[PDB]
Subunit: 444 residues, 3 copies
């Protein structure tokens, strides 16, 4: 299943054996709530609580109408994460909400949901969306609360109205503190049973349905709830769900740590770090590279990522793991003189970069220290090891089952003459450093 390989030559480790679940597109659906357009002298304590809860309903509608006085929009951005492009996440959902403001477009939705709660509607611009009516407050108020307008009430209707109205109030609270765009999509916007049935009635493959149904918590974190329109007794908000066009392709996570020399005199040390760490997944002949591995969510061996946070690299980028000096791909590195100690916890072990006077160890629960790292970059597997200490920092290692492979090799930092080594190169590569050394050497 999950395996790992550490490369002593480049101070890096690769965790193989994962499967992909990349979000490639969006599916926009319209969630609706039918409202009541409702306009005594009694002071009954049972009806006073009804008038109180009914005023919470009037204010919620007014608050949401005041909220839609403008076009919904989220804040847009317009190691190697700074190389990414800039997208507009809710651009697809906003385009669907723009259509619902066209005249007669809401009446098309209101009539389709007249005899059922769930319907597919083709909009005027051509988009085929799935529409869902999740709360019929119009039917409840006009059939139960209106016949009391008095003092013909009971305590059982006060409780039932507070329950039905509570969802509208909570949806309002979320939109009020999020400027009408929320993520992840809470259970008030879409309950678990509603989401599961929404996924089932969705035009996707059987493999996409089973994937989304077995990982609904991830689907929520990758969805947006966009407040849309209140018109003609209909409250509509667009839910924007992820499409996983890439499923079950190989994925692997590259971990990197600084590789420095271990000379005794302080300051005369040179360092080198592979900057291409992150998640990699095979995707359509290329490799989708996610520089900020903190953007992907891992469930057992499934990896959920968003292509918006990816670069599309040639598959030859994998050669940097075996031979960082290969002539087919220019492997990205950074150079530095900052030889500070740290550790990187991998999927099945821990990389340790111990330099200077730092105390680096690997311990077990009952027995204590079992390995003492010397100066340089080293690695230990989580088999038999429970914690790793670098300086004053205690790292817990991941206790997942898997086999690691230690690939011995000469650290490539030893191949560089420190006198002509180009320190302080942040976005560099093997060929750039060689081109810079060749200039410094010719100038001597």
């Amino acid at each position: 299943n999950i395996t790992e390989e550490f490369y002593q030559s480049t101070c890096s480790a690769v965790s193989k054996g994962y499967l992909s679940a990349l979000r490639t597109g969006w599916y926009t659906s319209v969630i609706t709530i039918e409202l009541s357009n409702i306009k005594c002298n009694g002071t009954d304590a049972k009806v006073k609580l009804i008038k109180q809860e009914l005023d919470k309903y009037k204010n919620a509608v007014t608050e949401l109408q005041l909220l839609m006085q403008s076009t919904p929009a989220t804040n847009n951005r317009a190691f190697l994460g700074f190389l990414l492009g800039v997208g507009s996440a809710i651009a697809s959902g906003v385009a669907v909400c723009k259509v619902l403001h066209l005249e007669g477009e809401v009446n098309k939705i209101k009539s389709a949901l007249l005899s059922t709660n769930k319907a597919v509607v083709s909009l005027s611009n051509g988009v085929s969306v799935l529409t869902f009516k999740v709360l019929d407050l119009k039917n409840y108020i006009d059939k139960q609360l209106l016949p009391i307008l008095c003092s013909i009430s009971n305590i059982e209707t006060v409780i039932e109205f507070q329950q039905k109205n509570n969802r509208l109030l909570e949806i309002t609270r979320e939109f009020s503190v999020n400027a009408g765009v929320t993520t992840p999509v809470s259970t008030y916007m879409l309950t678990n049973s509603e989401l599961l049935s929404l996924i089932n009635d969705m035009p996707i493959t059987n493999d996409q349905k089973k994937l989304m149904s077995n990982n609904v918590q991830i689907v929520r974190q990758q969805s947006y709830s966009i407040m849309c329109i209140i018109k003609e007794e209909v409250l509509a908000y667009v839910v924007q769900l992820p499409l996983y066009g890439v499923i079950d392709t190989p994925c692997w996570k590259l971990h990197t740590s600084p590789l420095c020399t271990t000379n005794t005199k302080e300051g005369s040390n040179i360092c080198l770090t592979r900057t291409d760490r992150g998640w990699y997944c095979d995707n359509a002949g290329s490799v989708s590279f996610f520089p900020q591995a903190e953007t992907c969510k891992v469930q057992s061996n499934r990896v959920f990522c968003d292509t918006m946070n990816s670069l599309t690299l040639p598959s030859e980028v994998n050669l940097c793991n075996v031979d960082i000096f290969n002539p087919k791909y220019d492997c990205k590195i950074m150079t530095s003189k900052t030889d500070v100690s740290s550790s990187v916890i991998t999927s099945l072990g821990a990389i340790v970069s111990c330099y200077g006077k730092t105390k680096c160890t690997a311990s077990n629960k009952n027995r204590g220290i079992i390995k003492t790292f010397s100066n340089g970059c080293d690695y230990v597997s989580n088999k038999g090891v429970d914690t790793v200490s670098v300086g004053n920092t205690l790292y817990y290692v991941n206790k997942q089952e898997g086999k690691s492979l230690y690939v011995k090799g000469e650290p490539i930092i030893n191949f560089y003459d420190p006198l002509v080594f180009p320190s302080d190169e942040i976005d560099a590569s093997i060929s750039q450093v060689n081109e810079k050394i060749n200039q410094s050497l010719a100038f001597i």
Copy 2:
């Protein structure tokens, strides 16, 4: 209204036509909740629920008193975002909460709100703050719950007490998971009707009132709720609201993308990227520049930003868009050899940086691909285009109405000799690169 101009020479696009709403200061207000200092043998099921809800009230007060055992403080920080300064956001509100601990200062507030819920109070240090009493639990408990202390109760008082007490419990929950400082300000801290009336009774211009009232959801996201003091049956917490001293000045958003050469042999390419992307707004003879455009919130054509996240640049910075080689301002760029493909979704179109073997296209809903980008930096408008693909990444473009202008020009990267081009310069400019090239040329 909204227009856009793409500059082929520098691979950048400017979106003009926006209006400003910059937060320049803070207005601190004091929100109060009057508490009851309350100290049978019956087992009535109606009174047992009252004793349960009353114990939730006692614990909430104790939890908030335990919360104020120290001075409230938020975590402080002390492309071009690293050039920003460091502020203390709640420093103004904390100074107001420090005054409320002075003796007799709380009694001044308690007496001002005796005959009304809303009052302006001048504190001892000279600050004139607006005080609001939003919940009188003291009056409810002492007039309704105290007369039952028994078993003279009904179910209608159990429900009404749970409703009034629920707000205090929720305010407590928020402060417990936020260390007494919350943002945005939820509807439990300040309801929509309370906030709107607070804005109305605020000493500001009529233009500031209408702006804040039409964008209350933004005012929440730019406000802080600071837990303050519990003393003498009074629960006080400071709400810190934004002041928009700059309103309706021109704003524009600068989008930049890497500009590289398109030579066939891999690695021999040089790249150049304008680093001055972000939001720009005219402000008091200068230009307020926001390097991280993700910090500003856009509502239709209004742009809400915080001057704390801005630099104050000369208005001559606008010359970099027309002539990046102008002698009046040193335009900021970065150099690199990393020619990776990406796209930047603009307000009215999309910039495409296609390099190497990447497949870059622009498509429509029904018809599919309509443009195939060649190697280099190019642009397409959202008119007729719905999606843009770079590699394995699908970008949805913004469907907002507006007119774009394509300004043809020679890409400035072609003006540089690659042999003496200074690659890997992150925080550089046009003059710095020229000064570095002149040194490499003189040394040959």
Copy 3:
């Protein structure tokens, strides 16, 4: 108590007088909720609300069981913050949740909590954890709701069941929008009274107990709630609490701002910035350095940090404050030509970097401007000063009591010849710049 020293030579200020509270480890506890495995024809309005609330209970259990279809895991990352290592925060808690899936392990917990709500249990792998039963829904349903299965009910049982079931529903909502791992730990996962007693029954020093009890809001923000297992009528989720192995050691916060020359001709200026800003705390003969001071939480004079976000540096790093040219430690700086104006609000004052044509002032509430900064880097104390203005940005200063010391000195940027000054060095030091200048000088 709190003091501050500004160094005019290096444009930096140190705030001394704080005490440490560094998280060094984790303590995992198991929170349990006993569930009821429950399987009429009446339409009574009192029993219909019971069947409604009972179906919310069935769905909550089903939703949580569907949530555990995989191993819980959070998104992992694998000025000087980029030098930090990479940990797995919930690795310790996940290893405890992995043990609860072993057969018979849950039955050990179920029997220990049979006669009490609070117990210490030694697991099969050897870990001694504290187990807590916080909700016995099994006892409530089987003793009160089961005897009605009808129409023997009252309204007092509908309210009491909605109250007890509400906590399970809220715990479910949090786990649904967080993929089973939440932080901070809300009051639904662990109430304030439960947490305080959990801290009391914890195997730690008396000093750790009093510290955690007086700062429970911080303990929440540094804890994780990990959804674990639902097996044999037991709902278990692991709460992972911080261990503060370092307490009451000296801490100080280093603030830095750009130091530039003030020549009249634009562009001919060189800049220099100390990059070692952040929090420093004495820790076990070394110094724990936190490069991103926004990760530490300050309560009065106590500083709560996490060693996972720290580097372990020699105590000689403190010499950079008095003598940045000391031969014992290579002080980290960055070089630049970007002379932009900004301010840094310190604990007791404000650093001002005024360059070019920027208007930099320091004002008071009633009197207005009292100091006008000239070009260069300067400092003002919060005594008598309420606000600081740099350009169009208004900074409020911290009004905390304390004494500042202005240490006069020649700005070290004046010691460098601009013709051979190495601009655009991001991760550099004093010795690196000298080594680069010596090369440029020998080449002339």
